[model samples]
Target: AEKTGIVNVSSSLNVREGASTSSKVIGSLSGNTKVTIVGEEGAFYKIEYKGSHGYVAKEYIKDIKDEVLEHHHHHH
Candidate 1:
């Protein structure tokens, strides 16, 4: 089994102003979703979804490889 990384919009994850908790919540995520990792910006990962660009807290997202392993471990 392998891990595939993606953003899961299960809760209201904060979109920070500068990639730290001390930053502001510029926006939020809703609905279960996934995104493509285009690049990195500071401590945040640059993701593209629904024709829009946004940032997600890097610490929160499950690693791509680890995520794949988790799915197989639990789902299978």
Candidate 2:
């Protein structure tokens, strides 16, 4: 499915090179920032940032329309 994710951090989120802090910080994304999610790691989201690959803490990210039950209703 094609979906856009939002950065849900309190202030800002560090976009790193890898899935954890062990990797260097490549960039930073502020709260409520919309990111292009490409894939997922252990607890991070593999995203496309700054025209490159970046990883952010999944705990601070959520799909724009992630509510699973929101699609339950259909109009004929």
Best by TM-score: 2
User: What is the C-alpha lDDT profile of model 1 across 21-65, one tens digit per residue?
Assistant: 666555666534444566778867766544456667766676454
Q: After superposition, how far is residue 53 of candidate 1 from its true place, in Å?
A: 3.0
TM-score of 2: 0.71
For residues 1-76, what per-residue lDDT tens digits would candidate 2 score against the true structure? 5446877877788888877766888778778878777567788878767767888776787765542245648876
What is the Å distance of residue 11 in model 2 from its true position?
1.4
TM-score, each model? Answer: 0.48, 0.71
The residue pairs in collision within model 1 are 2-68, 3-68, 4-68
Q: How well does model 2 score by local distance difference test?
A: 0.74
For model 1 the local lDDT of residue 28 reads 69
Model 1, poorest ten-residue lDDT window?
Answer: 63-72
